[PDB]
Paper text:
Connexins form large-pore channels that function either as dodecameric gap junctions or hexameric hemichannels to allow the regulated movement of small molecules and ions across cell membranes.
Encouraged by this, we therefore collected two further datasets at higher (90 mmHg) and lower (20 mmHg) PCO2 levels. At low PCO2, the density for the N terminus is less defined, giving an apparently more open pore: (A) 20 mmHg (B), 55 mmHg (C), and 90 mmHg. Our inference from all the maps we examined, irrespective of particle number, lowpass resolution filter, masking, etc., was that the density associated with the N terminus was more distinct in the data obtained at high PCO2 relative to that with low PCO2. On the other hand, in the map associated with the top class from the 20 mmHg PCO2 data, which contained 58% of the particles, the density associated with the N terminus was less defined and indicative of adopting a position nearer to the cytoplasmic side. In our structures, there does appear to be some degree of flexibility in this area, and the variability analysis from cryoSPARC for the structure at low PCO2 indicates a slight breathing at this point.
Numbering used by the authors:
A (entry chain E), B (entry chain D), C (entry chain C), D (entry chain B), E (entry chain A), F (entry chain F): 4 to 102, 129 to 217
The structure:
């Protein structure tokens, strides 16, 4: 709808890599998250199965091993990497309404925050889920589960495929931002 | 759709902080509530589990500990902090149709109500839920539950993460409004 | 979408209170009904629990105590209070296509029907549900329930909060319409 | 969206009653069907309860007493009463593209089909469901149900309220069409 | 939305029957499929009931008697009868961009494919489902069902009503296309 | 909505086959995936039935035989075959903003990536699912299933019909791209 119209304006104001490659990969990630990945995680808790009769053990074991869902993490990441661009668009429009360094300092800082947000969320993915591969079986001993209980994840393989996809694209977006930084560094 | 078009008009009529930072944080909260948080709370009652055989104990215990859902509280808060801006937009448009102090008094009062509504809802969150952290286990003794019954919350950790997020952003919006008040106070 | 565009036209043709305050409160009620209240009532019958083994007792007890849902009553009320405005918009447009008293008599009658419809639905709410507070427990003795059966309502407290909200706003809309009537009465 | 834009064109081409009253009542019926009535019938078969252990008896008893749902009947009726208007709109547009009696004969026939379709569907409602009141209990003896089985309808009272509403409005639309016919009859 | 805008362009480029009657019946079928029929088939497998204890017998019996759902067959048919029109629209637009027989041969062939696709899908409906009437009871003896198992269809009568409706309209569309062929045949 | 407007621009910039046939088949695949196929796979795991009492055996057997769903594979394929066209559209627009071989090399490479992506996904379909026919019965011996367990697929025949459809259209799109390559090869 209006999203592509809005992205058209920010498309008209960027650099070689920024106009084309960064914008395409950003839309690439949104399409994957929306049309494909969001329904892989639909039954994440409904189809989580634990071999026990203890009431409440399923709730605490799912919450222990999935403190925040993968799709919610990716939704937050896309929002954080798109706000610096949104700020520049309004900042330029505000400057136009009133009417080198002013735009240069904002634009350079704008791509600096995207690298930080991109790397921070990638780091969170690794430490929180201990690698990018999801297991079929999780062993849970949190109260009130008696001793250790076996619980089984829903669609672990398909979730691994989409996890590798999102991580790979995010890593590419980091490299593109770094090269854009170098092109504005050699300019001096 | 038309929401960003409407927000464009109120964007053209504000001050330095108001045009950019307050508008972005407002859109920031809406995006989190809509695309991410609204489906964390989807199974709040369906996956609420109580260790009992008493019919009706689950209904009364959920109602006792969640008198109003977090997402409904945030939906009300966003509506209340956006109506003073909506009133100004129509008030100015009405003034334009007919055609310093008149706009100054409205604008100053407009940011005064936003601070009150923002703080009031933040206060309600603290007293009603006793802090911003959701527990795995709630103990319930309301009739008809016999003695005290253990009940287990769905996704307590993910709900805590989004609760901290919404509270933190709301606190920032309060500070931005206060600074805008100071800039219009030193003007005299 | 187009709803705000349509409301813009009727905004350009009204009086001081009518242009701003009545229009805002009308949009205020629609937002509450759509984005917040409509999913409080989602599981009204699914989570209605009765302490019995009699087949069909749940169906007849829910139907006895909720002959028409609150959200359906509010949906009907908003439609009825918006059609007199819709009639005027087409009546004026028809008059414009062909091309004081003619518009005055229609406009005065237009706000007269809104008061009647607003008060009629408020009266129905009171008599049908016996006050604006929803109870946790309902006692039901309709056939085929044996003797008297205890049944438990879903989310009674949250439904009470939204009921008080909609009633309070509707009462304010009545007062605004009455004042508009007085302003057109003192004119003579 | 575009529906009101399309209805605006046919609004500009009609008569006194046709431009305003018939168009409003048509939109009145669509709003009731869409925003309110369509979710009263959502659990029509899911909450249909029969007092039996015979497999398949629930399927045949629901199908016997509800050969076609009320909402599907109303959806068909609205489509049938809106196509004669749609034909005229394209027929006039086609005539405009190429460029008294020609339009008069089409317009007069156009309101003649609406009366027939309106009355035909109203007749079907009466004979198929034996009045406009829905009962709590239906007795079913179709195979494979043993002897006669008691089955219980979901939300019979709320469905009766909306049935009376749709029938009453349809009867009014018939009267408006007849008066329009008389105005074009006295013209001669 | 944009669908009626697109259909407006192809409306401006057709013949007497093609501009009006064929276009209306095509929209007539889409409306029935979308707003009414698509939710009759919603619980086709969920409410399919078999009188057995054999695991997997329900899956194989439903798959045996409904190799492809009616609504999916109609969705494919509408796509196939609308692509020849879509090809002509782009072919003409391409010809316009570059800038009797060329358009005549395409248009004549365009209505020739619609007749073939319309008749082919109607033939598939008859052979696959053995007439246009759906039965309440199906007897199934595919492995792993022991001996012959009784299974019961959901909403057989309502599905029969919509099946007769779609078949009747499709047969009318065939006759309209044939008459258009004759009008272009007598021209010579 | 805006998708057809965007496709209109890329329609105006292509060759004979590319403007018409490749664009139509691309829209042909999207329509099938969206309006028809996406709800065949809706209950892929909900209606997956295994003849066992072992907890967790259903989760591991479904994950073993469907590592990634067919609809998710097709969603990825459509995204990958549409990005080279999207890159060209922005690359040309960027060139227009600044202002033979430059466009020729991009366009020729653009159709070269589409052939590679089209063939790669078709190869994945064959090796992963061992042909294009889905079976009613799958035998599963992954841990924790004891010995070998019989499991039954939901709607195997309808999924086979749509699988053959998508594969056949993709093979045609490969042939069209190859012919376009030959036309640009004989040019030299």
């Amino acid at each position: 709808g209006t999203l592509q119209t809005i992205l058209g304006g920010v498309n008209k104001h960027s650099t070689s890599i920024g106009k084309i490659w960064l914008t395409v990969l950003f839309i690439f990630r949104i399409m994957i998250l929306v049309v494909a990945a969001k329904e892989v995680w639909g039954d994440e808790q409904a189809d989580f199965v634990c071999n026990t009769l203890q009431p409440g053990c399923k709730n605490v074991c799912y919450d222990h091993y999935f403190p925040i869902s993968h799709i919610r993490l990716w939704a937050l990441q896309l929002i954080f990497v798109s706000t610096p661009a949104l700020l520049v668009a309004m900042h330029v429009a505000y400057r136009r309404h009133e009417k080198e360094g002013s735009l240069w300092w904002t634009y350079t800082s704008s791509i600096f925050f995207r690298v930080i947000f991109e790397a921070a969320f990638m780091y969170v993915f690794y430490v929180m889920y201990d690698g990018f591969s999801m297991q079929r079986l999780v062993k849970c001993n949190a109260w009130p589960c008696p001793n250790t209980v076996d619980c089984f994840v829903s669609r672990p393989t398909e979730k691994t495929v989409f996890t590798v996809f999102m991580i790979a694209v995010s890593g590419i977006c980091i490299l593109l931002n770094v090269t854009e930084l170098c092109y504005l560094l050699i300019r001096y």
